[PDB]
Amino acid sequence: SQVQLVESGGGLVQPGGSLRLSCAASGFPFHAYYMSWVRQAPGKGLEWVSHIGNGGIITRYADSVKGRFTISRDNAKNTLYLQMTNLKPEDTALYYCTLGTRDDLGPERGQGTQVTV
Amino acid sequence: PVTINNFNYNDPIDNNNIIMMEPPFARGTGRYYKAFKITDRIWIIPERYTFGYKPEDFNKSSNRDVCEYYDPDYLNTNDKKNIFLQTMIKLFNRIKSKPLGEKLLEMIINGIPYLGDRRVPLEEFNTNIASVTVNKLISNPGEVERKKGIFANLIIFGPGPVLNENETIDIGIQNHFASREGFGGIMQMKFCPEYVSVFNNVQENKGASIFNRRGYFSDPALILMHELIHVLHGLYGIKVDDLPIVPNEKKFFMQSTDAIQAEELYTFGGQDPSIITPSTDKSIYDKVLQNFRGIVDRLNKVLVCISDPNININIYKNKFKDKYKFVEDSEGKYSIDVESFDKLYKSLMFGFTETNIAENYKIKTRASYFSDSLPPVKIKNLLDNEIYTIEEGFNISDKDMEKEYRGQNKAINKQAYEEIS
Amino acid sequence: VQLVESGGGLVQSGGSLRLSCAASGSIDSLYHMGWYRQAPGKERELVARVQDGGSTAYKDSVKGRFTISRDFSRSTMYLQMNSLKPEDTAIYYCAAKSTISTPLSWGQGTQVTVS
Ligand SMILES: [Zn+2]
Incomplete structure (x- = not known):
């Protein structure tokens, strides 16, 4: 028995457009875990974008x-959302979904999605 | 007297009885959860217990019966969370309705953890540790994170991966536990109130043939009060360290002969501590007194609290003098009275047990902690007063369920429960 | 690890003062730095504190x-x-803790009198 995180919502949009990202979780109780979006940009290190608590009350952004x-x-459709608005070139990267918070990122991560403005 | 707060799960975060709280093992991680203050120093957090587990441990699945029941969807909607919370409110009012259980709540509420642990020098009070304080989110959930450390004694969660596996949990650092060393520390519990235990180790069954044996299910209030007794031990720092106890024979009250933690046998009461040799029993007593000696020695040396101004050192030295029943002299310096230590040691260790609480609440429990695991069942609706009440549990006189604990009898009250299969 | 305070006051009521605490080593990482004051024949109090992250109280x-x-x-x-x-009239100290277990090293103190 294992976890699966598969994300969608990818590719070029013009700056500054909008893009919705999504992530489908399977193999564990989604509702019981904090979730984070993290992105990897060219040449730059890994960067944490946002996180949200079990029940959606707690939200944090970079x-x-x-x-x-x-x-x-x-938590009903076991789906995680990142709504991107006013997109910049700075935002062009590999977007991952992973468990936990900024300060406790957890091992499980999805395949990744590319976004390019 | 003890007051049990009432609230709804969707009630707003007012930071009075409802806060956003970062629990001890989540310290500095940023994980807050909606917490509900059922009583002073006691919180209910209607979330699944996840720390120390793999997220896929919650999802285990396959004609066999296993002792462990899994259900990852438990507490997975706000309405489920609210049922958990209302059930917990009802179980606590159940506990409050006899003098014996209200007293238990009071010693738990008043049993405050020492301000520090083994790592803190004798001179200081330090409240900046996970076993003395938790983080309260004091900013709006919309705003940049600001928090404040508050005191607390007990935090109750929903189940971990195995639903019927209720457990009381202490905080360990570098292999030591403040809850086992005189200090006390914030206690935690994973609890699931409707998936209860079943037992047939009762003395009436002792003569009985195989197909004449009786079966009962537990009162969740008693399952909880048992967990609260571990909680009381951990707050007074006397919860017994790792010490498995091996019986030299099956005795008449036993059903199995497996090794059991000494902490469990004292908690259960009955005849279970007769299994413990007086030699090991004396050293447990010796160790506690030594730990209490270490506490009083601190109380004579503490000059400062380094973490929290607005903490009055004099006030707190006095509160702890009450907790531990220390005696004071003309220097203003404290010391132990061994005669007064024995009173406190006895009430904590032998005064509250599952056995005497069951007798006092008229609740059928098992004859000994040395009992087999049976498959657990699910209580359909503890919130329905036709099935389960605050005053008498399942054993309601008005439904003829009071005699011989028929309310708990699997062969009689089959509408109270269903098989988990 | 040593500390020396400076800044001594006989200042009028409503006036202001700046105390200073000099350390023999690096102060950026300490588990604890705090200002304490003890009135004549009274107990020490914690006035202000900084934690290893920079949380101040x-x-x-x-x-x-x-x-x-x-x-x-x-x-x-x-x-x-x-x-x-x-x-606010008292002798003001400055203490530092290198770790949660390092005992406090204190300074000699600096006095503050407030007519
Ligand atoms: Zn137990």
């Missing part, structure tokens, strides 16, 4: 994307 | 008025006290 991104979950 | 009786500052490059901790009342 200051890099704060005015622009919103983080959502639907 | 204050006694209620001094909030708004006292602010903890920190110069790493000079390894020095300041207490900037404004609007001092006569009640």
Whole structure:
């Protein structure tokens, strides 16, 4: 028995457009875990984008994307959402979904999705 | 007296009885959860217990019966969370309705952890540890994170991966536990109130042939009060360290002969501690007194609290003088009275047990902690007063269920429960 | 690890003062730095504290008025006290803890009198 995180919502949009990212979780009780979006950009190290608590009350964003991104979950469809708005070139990267918080990122990660503005 | 708060799960976060709380093992991680203050120093967090587990441990599946029942969907909606919370409120009012259980709540509420642990120098009070404080989110959930450490004694979660496996849990650092060393520490519990245990180790069954044996299911209030007794031990720092106890024979009250933690046998009461040799029993007593000696020695040396101004050192030295029943002299310095230590040691270790609480609440329990695991059942609706009440549990006189604990009898009250299969 | 305080006051009620704590080593990483005051024939109190992350706390009786500052490059901790009342009259110490288990090393103190 193992976990699966598969994300969708990818590719070029013009700056500054919008893009919705998504992630489907299987193999564990989704509703019981904090979830994070993390991105990898060219030449740059790994960067944490946002996280959300079990019940969606707690949301946290990097200051890099704060005015622009919103983080959502639907515990019924076992889906995680990242809504990207006012997209910049700075945002072009490999977007991952992974368990836990900024300060406790957890091993499980998805395949990854590419976004390019 | 003890007051049990009432609330709904969707009630707003007012930071009075409902806060967003970062529990001890999640310290500095940023994980907050909606917490509900059922009583002073006691919180209910209607979430699954996940720390120390793999997320796929919750999902285990396959004509056989196993002792462990899994259900990952438990507490997976706000309405489920609210049922858990209302059930917990009802179980606590159940506990409060006899003098014996209200007293238990009070010693738990008043049993505050020492301000520090083994790592803290004798001179200081330090409240900045996971076993003395938790983080309260004081900013709005919308805003940049700001938090404040509050005191707390007990935090109750929903089940981990195995639903019927209720457990009381202490905080361990570098292989030591403040809860086992005189200090006390914030206690935690994973609890699941409707998946209860079943037992047939009762003295009436002792003569009985195989197909004449009786079967009962537990009162969840008693399952909880048992867990609260571990909680009381951990708050007074006397919870027994790793010490498995091996019987030299099956005795009449036993059903199995497996090794059991000494902490369990004292908690169960009955005849279970007769299994413990007086030699090991004396050293447990010796170790506690030595730990209490270490506490009083601190109380004479503490000059400062380094973490929290607004903490009054004098006030707290006095509160702890009450917790541990220490005696004071003309220097203002404290010391142990061994005669007064024995009173406190006895009430904590032998005063509250599962056995005497069951007798006092008129609840059928098992004859000994040395009993086989049976498959657990599910109580359909503890919130329905036709099945389960605050005053008498399943054994309601008005439904003729009071005699011979028929309310708990699997062969009689089959509408109270269903098989988990 | 050594500490020396400076900044001594006979200042009028409502005036202000800046205390200084000089350390023999690096102060950026310490588990604990705090300002303490002991009145004549009374007990020490924690006035203001900084934690290893930089979380700072204050006694209620001094909030708004006292602010903890920190110069790493000079390894020095300041207490900037404004609007001092006569009640703030005491000998002020400065203590530091290298770890949760390192005992406090104290300074000799610096006096504050508030007519
Ligand atoms: Zn137990």
